[PDB]
Design a protein around this nucleic acid. Structure first.
Length: 670
RNA sequence: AAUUUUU
């Protein structure tokens, strides 16, 4: 009864594209949005489950968000500012999730921005050209500063001095400017030999400064003396050149300690008291750690007075760290491509496979009591966009996948093995996979449909063996010498006695089990058919299994009843020109349709119009419309455990789990 | 694992 959101991956190589504020609110730049996560007691989570929840998304930017900064002024914790490759800096209100005000002052790509800790309405941003804008949103004032012709990597307002800002550059230079003095350089800090990844000011006054660099050192500067006081060299730890991003977190609670990032995304707490010994402590001493570099660290203090630290990483995980134990309280996984596919296993209830465009299958254990985002990654053998997924009907852990390259493979979810790869490769992208009875000349066979329109029948147990093109059986059995339509969808009836094929011309053909005799042809659709779905067998009316839903590049959805024609098994093929039911309201093509396992005659549709709609197919009534995605939907799967609950993925790198009863709208937008 | 990735 709780909606969940699998978000896009936090953006890489940004000095500050994630922040957090007291009372458990965290924000991180993913793709062209910022995602807000409530963490701590106020998340309202059930006990025994990580106390975090995705609650909001900041939609508005046209391009990659490069920077994100919360207001840390008491009473103003709801406002935040972002930066984007679209040249704009936007002030946001998290309560309403809308843009308070924006500016387009930078003339070059923005590097980072920072909300001033001493001026309520002052946000300072800087670009790759070296230009810095001081912006006071209260009365739209603006200051244009140029310090040096060098690329800015990071910038950090002094916490004790309103006029003091620290700027770190790609060449390793670090300078401290005064805003009152037209960004006059007060101090120039030379020592680093490589790009500056983060600047952290001492939380106490009396003016120390910490900098982290690709040159694998952390420097502590004295702003009064203007020179470095202490140099730290990142250690080499167990488990060619290694990528490194070196960010720093200087905890107010422990002024003595410093926590920076290390190779492979290890985290380190440095004890500055033991300067000469140069002691450090490794986070999670006892696979809870990141497997790739960490870009951002965000302190979060919950209302419980528990001190946490959120980390963002190239490994596409957001991790929450408890500062007291140095252990990982929870991890939030993320997607790095479009959610092309969504498949719920019949044998293993709860397990939902996700075909992602980053070339990695995710398996999400929806059933987990202890973990709401319990997701296992399968990258072996994929390496290509996963465009199609289909669980095995009987065998558990057996997962069939298809790729943009036309490759079809068979994964063992339970094993650590690489998947078996079918020797036969589709010429185009694999649109759909389906399990059904074997056909000549070949227990269950695996059927793959290529974007070139060829349906192939592979041997699951001898995937190395040549797959057979089903068109040959269709021609021989039905005595058909005309050129067969190119197939775009393959679907089996629940009994597996009937196979439906959808073709690029929009027609749909129905075949009988033994040797694929053509029983009937349906010509409702006038564009390529993307999706066909048969109704489940367990229902108040027995004849309900004969209902077939159909989705094409037109927005209209058709339902057909095939009990009359299937029962007749006529010697000569029958053509249906009239639909049993007509589902009208989408605005763009239909990518996927799915009948509900819990209710008779209830269909969910996904569409390029960016919405999913649920229908009572029998009364041709639109029940509810889900508008949470910000892109085109590609796939829908009904929850097999909850009747009100649906999963959809879209081209916005998002999977949403939403409740039919929670939607505010009945029908798709006009 | 690979990846300055974001079709």
């Amino acid at each position: 009864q709780e909606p969940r959101t699998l978000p896009p991956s936090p953006n890489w190589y940004c000095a500050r594209c994630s922040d957090a504020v007291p009372g458990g609110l965290f924000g991180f730049a993913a793709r062209t949005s910022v995602f807000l996560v409530r963490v701590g007691p106020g998340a309202g989570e059930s006990p025994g489950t990580p106390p975090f929840r995705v609650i909001g998304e900041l939609v508005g930017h046209t391009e990659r968000v490069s920077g994100f900064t919360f207001s840390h002024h008491p009473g103003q914790y709801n406002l935040c500012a972002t930066s984007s490759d679209d040249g704009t800096v936007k002030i946001w209100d998290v309560e309403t999730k809308t843009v308070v005000t924006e500016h387009a002052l930078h003339q070059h790509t923005i590097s980072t921005l920072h909300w001033s800790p001493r001026v309520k309405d002052l946000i300072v941003s800087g670009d790759e050209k070296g230009v810095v804008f001081c912006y006071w949103f209260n009365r739209n004032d603006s200051q244009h500063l140029f310090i040096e012709p060098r690329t800015i990597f990071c910038l950090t307002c002094s916490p004790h001095h309103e006029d003091l800002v620290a700027i770190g550059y790609k060449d390793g230079i670090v300078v401290i400017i005064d805003i009152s003095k037209k960004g006059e350089v007060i101090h120039r800090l030379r020592g680093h030999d490589d790009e500056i990844h983060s600047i952290a000011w001492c939380p106490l006054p009396g003016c120390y400064l910490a900098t982290g660099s690709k040159d694998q050192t952390i420097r502590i500067w004295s702003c009064s003396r203007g020179r470095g006081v202490m140099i730290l060299k990142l250690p080499f730890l167990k488990r060619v050149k290694e990528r490194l991003w070196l960010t720093l977190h200087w905890p107010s609670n422990q002024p003595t300690q410093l926590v920076s990032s290390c190779f492979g995304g290890e985290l380190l707490q440095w004890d500055l008291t033991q300067s000469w010994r140069r002691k450090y402590t490794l986070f999670s001493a006892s696979g809870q750690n990141h497997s790739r570099i960490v870009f951002n660290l965000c302190p979060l203090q919950t209302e419980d007075d528990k001190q946490l630290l959120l980390s963002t990483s190239m490994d596409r995980d957001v991790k929450c760290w408890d500062i007291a134990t140095l252990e990982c309280s929870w991890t939030l996984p993320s997607l790095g491509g479009f959610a092309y596919s969504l498949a719920f296993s019949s044998v293993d209830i709860g397990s939902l496979a996700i075909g992602v465009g980053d070339g990695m299958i995710r398996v999400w254990n929806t059933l987990s009591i202890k973990n709401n985002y319990d997701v296992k990654n399968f990258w072996q053998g994929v390496k290509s966009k996963v465009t199609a997924l289909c669980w095995h009907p009987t065998k558990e852990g057996c997962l069939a996948f298809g790729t943009d390259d036309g490759k079809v493979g068979l994964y063992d979810t339970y094993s650590n093995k690489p998947p078996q790869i079918s020797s036969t490769y589709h010429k185009k992208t694999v649109y759909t996979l389906a399990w059904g009875p074997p056909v000549p000349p070949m227990s269950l066979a695996l059927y793959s449909c290529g974007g070139e329109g060829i349906v192939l029948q592979h041997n699951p147990w001898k995937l190395s063996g040549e797959a057979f093109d089903i068109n040959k059986l269709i021609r021989d059995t039905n005595s058909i010498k005309y050129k067969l339509p190119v197939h775009t969808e393959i679907s089996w009836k629940a009994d597996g006695k009937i196979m439906a094929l959808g073709n690029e011309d929009g027609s749909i053909e129905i075949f009988q089990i033994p040797n694929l005799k053509l029983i009937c042809t349906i010509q409702q659709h006038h564009k390529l058919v993307n999706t066909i779905s048969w109704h489940h067998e367990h229902g108040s009316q027995p004849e309900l299994s004969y209902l077939m839903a159909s989705g094409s590049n037109n927005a209209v959805i058709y339902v057909h009843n095939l009990k009359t024609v299937i029962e007749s098994s006529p010697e000569s093929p029958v053509t249906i020109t009239e639909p049993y039911r007509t589902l009208s309201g989408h605005t763009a093509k239909i990518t996927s349709v799915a009948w509900s396992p819990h209710h008779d005659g209830r269909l969910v549709s996904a569409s390029y119009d960016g919405t999913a709609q649920v229908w009572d197919a029998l009364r041709e009534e639109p029940l509810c419309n889900f508008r949470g995605h910000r892109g085109r939907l590609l796939c829908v799967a009904w929850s097999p455990l909850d009747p009100d609950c649906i999963y959809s993925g879209a081209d916005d790198f998002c999977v949403h789990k939403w409740l039919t009863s929670m939607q505010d709208h009945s029908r798709p937008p006009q």
